[PDB]
Amino acid sequence: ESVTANIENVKKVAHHIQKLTSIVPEIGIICGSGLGKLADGVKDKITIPYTKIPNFPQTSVVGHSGNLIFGTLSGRKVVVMQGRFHMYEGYSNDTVALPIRVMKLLGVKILMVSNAAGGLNRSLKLGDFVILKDHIYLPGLGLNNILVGPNQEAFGTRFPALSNAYDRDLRKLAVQVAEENGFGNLVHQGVYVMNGGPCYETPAECTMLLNMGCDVVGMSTIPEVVIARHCGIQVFAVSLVTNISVLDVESDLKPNHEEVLATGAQRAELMQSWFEKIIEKLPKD
Amino acid sequence: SVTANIENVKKVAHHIQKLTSIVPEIGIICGSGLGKLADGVKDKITIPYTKIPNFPQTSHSGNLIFGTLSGRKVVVMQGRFHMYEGYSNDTVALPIRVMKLLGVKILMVSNAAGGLNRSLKLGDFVILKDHIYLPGLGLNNILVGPNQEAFGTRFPALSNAYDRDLRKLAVQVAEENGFGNLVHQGVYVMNGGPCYETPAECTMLLNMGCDVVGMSTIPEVVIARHCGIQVFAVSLVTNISVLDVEQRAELMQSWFEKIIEKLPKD
Amino acid sequence: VTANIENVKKVAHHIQKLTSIVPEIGIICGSGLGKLADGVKDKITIPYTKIPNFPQTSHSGNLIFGTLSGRKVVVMQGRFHMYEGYSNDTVALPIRVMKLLGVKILMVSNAAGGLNRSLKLGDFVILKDHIYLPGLGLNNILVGPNQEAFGTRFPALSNAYDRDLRKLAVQVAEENGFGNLVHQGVYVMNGGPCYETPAECTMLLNMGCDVVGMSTIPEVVIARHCGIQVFAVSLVTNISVLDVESDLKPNHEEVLATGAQRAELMQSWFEKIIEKLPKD
Ligand SMILES: Nc1[nH]c(=O)[nH]c(=O)c1Br
Ligand SMILES: Nc1[nH]c(=O)[nH]c(=O)c1Br
Ligand SMILES: Nc1[nH]c(=O)[nH]c(=O)c1Br
């Protein structure tokens, strides 16, 4: 489980970070599919490798450590997480939760996140943006909920509600910004379902998930969202449709990570612009 | 914690049998309204979990309460062990297996649940007639691990898990006492928890054929059926699930008491 | 013991010192395949107990090497089901060893409940797809660091049940007079060890599932991950009870009996399939 995401450990990490930077983030951004360039474009940044933060969880992309990036974006103070902790990697609940709880103590009020997802809904097109308006946490309904274990009262309640988990005001703003900027047609809202992974979904699985009312399927994000809502951080989440789910076994169509990465790199520029323009218009401030 | 094997369970049961002469035939786990019941058991002996070696401990320390209720010898279990708290399979199972060794023939369980079925109202009683054990189908079944053969078989059937005869009687008792309009029978689905269910989740669960949702009870029911204890269980509907993002306690304890009065006795 | 390239090579090498047979087909005995090892000619039998670091399972399991239908095979007698408490690495290691040993095709049988209302006791349901409930729910056998010598981080499962093998299996059945017994269907894994409730069966049927069992999928995922072609068949050992009022119920002794009844046929079917596999 590594180090417990309790108030004492989370404070020690926040304080270490606060010695490394004077940027107090209002907005946290977890870089997923399509956000690689956003991460790169933060103004007046300070980059802190995970390896330099005692008790911060460790992750790499082929040996290269993840980073926390502080600075501004559209004139608002941000922390960007470049490097995520996916459960199919075997990370514990505490490992995944600790960074989100650190954001809470640093001052984050709003969390923005992207991911790659397979398009289940038959109206979706490759490269579409699907704003999350709800989710189905399959691991969580099992006994693999990120909050399973003693509750950390300092951060939230034993039985958190997930009613308005995907803040309806942030969703309205995101849609407006897309419409205003000419790409409203690329933007949908939908139900995201988590497959613990790391296998792509079989056609029978995709058919089942579609019939359950799911619009997109992915392997990430929900656990971070749950920790965020648990501690009162407002959440905005987007899936980039990186492949269209195959519903028939007798198809030679096949999911592959290469094409998922490619759709991500191709949409990165537009996704960056969307996020920067949302941020410019975020409520208050 | 300690493996819920026959030796560890025998140890605990044998200890309790030195503290009470009461051989319980009915076991009761009050989840929803109340406690109380326990309200009312006579000639009672109260045993803190903390005074029972190798017994699981709460995280108000729980109690086993022995005595007579509606003329029958009972053990009431006050203080539950839920999987969302992080308890192990063995921890959750041990208390139920201890009941088996003490003489328990019938387990009666109450809980609070969210109403999925759109015909349900706040305060309705939903007798479980079946369940969907999501964690169990997903490789988190309380029986995963070596089978404890002294207690039951490797692949238990869950046919008549919620004894149909006990359900008929419970319905008869409710109807005789004028609250039969509050009683439904339904399928309970376990959400591992501890998050409440999203509207998308609730919609899927309803469409899976589920009537109520909760985070408990099924693990205990599985262990009870595995060792041949008959089960009766009821959900109190304590909220109505939202499907789109866009003193009842006292009636229940009274119902349980009146059922026990009419239970068969060997 | 991690199912990584180092540990798996060590096991494979030990095995290679005990047999010169380089298997091209690996077979996992489940329901109906009890007799299969007996047909194996020029066989050597290697108890799991005699293989350092190979996982161990109860009257010790065996690896049987030899010739079946003119082809080199390794038969696995004794499996590792997740409801017994086995680890991901424990289940995956034997499959990865098969791969290092030269296996190109895995054939597997299992017992399953018949969800599809047209199924009959003793029918054969060739798997053409699956629903891995434990895998959707974060208990996927591949969870953890990906072992790159074996395969990719995100394996696809689109033709997991090799269609061509499926076509041959059906052809063999039809030409041998038991085509009426054979179906193709979707298998759903229940992590187990409980039989499914009536409400659970109804839900699974409505999910598009034809049969339900507690095995096989984890091994299939590992095989596919390392590029082994898979053929898998469920024997319908009991008809799922969907009606909570019903008197019918699954009985494990009847399940065993049904599987054993079909053993001779299942054997013949597998042998005749292997006989017709394209060789070069
Ligand atoms: N990027 C994708 N594509 C897919 O088909 N299923 C998934 O879980 C992810 Br992540
Ligand atoms: N009491 C409730 N209400 C609900 O909507 N969901 C639950 O899991 C429980 Br417990
Ligand atoms: N043999 C069976 N029968 C059934 O109804 N469910 C199962 O999971 C297995 Br294995």
Apex C51 CA angle, C45 and C53, nearest 5? 150
> Over the Cα atoms of chain A, what is R_g?
18
Closest chain B residue to C136, measured at CA: B138
List, as one string, the DSSP characters of C29-74. Answer: --TT-TTHHHH-EEEEEEEGGGSTTS-------EEEEEEETTEEEE
What's the full length of chain A, in residues? 285
Q: How close is the nearest chain A Cα to the Cα of C145, in Å? A: 5
Catalytic site residue A89?
yes
Chain C CB contacts of A89 under 8 Å are: 143-145
Q: Do C194 and B133 touch (CB under 8 A)?
A: yes
CA of B82 to the centre of ligand 2 (A): 14
Q: B1-266, superfamily in CATH?
A: Nucleoside phosphorylase domain (3.40.50.1580)
Amino acid at B76: V
Tell me if residue B15 falls in helix, strand or coil: helix
Among residues A90, A95, A98, A164, the alpha carbon closest in space to that of A132 is found at A164
Identify the active-site residue in C62, C76, C81, C116. Answer: C81
CA distance B73 to chain C (A): 31
Burial A150-187 (b: 16+ CB within 10 A, else e): ebbeebbeeebebeebbbeebbebbbebbeeeeeeebb
Whether ligand 3 lies within 6 angstroms of the CB of C62 is answered as no
Place of tokens 């208990």: C139
Closest CA to B142 of B156, B160, B128, B161: B156
Dihedral, CA atoms, C115, C116, C119, C125, nearest 10 degrees?
Answer: -80
Q: Say whether C187 counts as a known binding-site residue.
A: no
Instruction: Pick the catalytic residue from A9, A33, A114, A245.
Output: A33
Q: Please give the distance of CA A247 from its chain centroid, rounded to a whole number.
A: 26
The pair of three-digit structure tokens given for residue A63, joined into one six-digit string: 């040996």
Give the distance (Å) from ligand 2 centre to CA of residue B114: 4
Asked if the C-beta of B207 comes within 8 angstroms of chain A's C-beta atoms, the answer is yes
Distance from CA of C148 to the nearest CA of A (A): 12
What's the CATH fold of domain C1-280? Answer: Rossmann fold (3.40.50)
Reading the block at residue A146, the tokens are: 């990120």
List chain C residues with CB under 8 Å of B210: 199
Q: Where are the beta strands (DSSP E) in chain B?
A: 26-29, 42-48, 63-69, 72-78, 106-115, 125-132, 183-190, 212-214, 230-240
Atom 3 in ligand 1: which residue has the minimum CA distance?
A118
CA distance B138 to chain C (A): 4
Helix residue ranges per DSSP H, A67-167: 93-106, 138-141
Domain locations along chain B = 1-266
- What tokens were used for A238? 């987007």
Residue of C nearest to A60 (CA): C145
Distance in Å from the first CA to the final CA of chain A = 38
Query: What DSSP character marks residue A220?
Result: S
Asked if residues A26 and A64 have their Cβ atoms less than 8 Å apart, the reply is: no
In this structure, the strands spanning B183-190 and C41-47 are unpaired
**Could you confirm whether C132 is annotated as catalytic?**
no
What is the atom index within ligand 3 of the atom nearest the CA of C215? Answer: 10
Compute φ and ψ for C47, nearest 5 degrees: -55, 145
Residue listed under structure tokens 């596919």: C224
Give chain A positions within 8 Å (CB) of C130: 202, 204-205
The alpha carbon dihedral of B12, B14, B17, B18 has a sign of negative
Omega into C23 within 30° of 0, i.e. cis? no
Contact C266, C235 (CB under 8 A): yes
CA gap C243, C7 in Å, rounded? 48
Amino acid code (one letter) for B143: L
Considering only CA atoms, which of C254, C247, C243, C234 is closest in space to residue C185? C234
Pocket flag, ligand 3, residue C213 (CB < 6 Å): yes
Classify the phi-psi angles of C70: left when phi > 0, otherwise alpha if psi is within -120 to 50, otherwise beta. left
All residues at 6 or more sequence positions from A134 whose CB lies less than 8 Å from its CB, including other chains: A165, A166, A191, A192, B198, B199, B200, B245
- Helix count (H) and strand count (E) of chain B? 7, 9
Q: Which amino acid makes up residue B98?
A: V
DSSP string, A7-56: HHHHHHHHHHHHTT-----SEEEE--TT-HHHHHT-EEEEEEEGGGSTTS
Nearest CB to A197 within list C140, C160, C186: C140
Q: How far apart are CA A159 and CA B113, in angstroms?
A: 13
**Which ligand approaches the C-alpha of residue C197 most closely?**
3
A-B contacts (CB, under 8 Å): 91
Q: Which CATH architecture has domain A1-285?
A: 3-Layer(aba) Sandwich (3.40)
> What SS3 state is found at C195?
coil
Region label for B28, one of left (φ > 0), alpha (ψ between -120 and 50) or beta (otherwise)? beta
Q: Is C135 on the interface with A (CB under 8 A)?
A: yes
Has A230 been annotated as catalytic? no
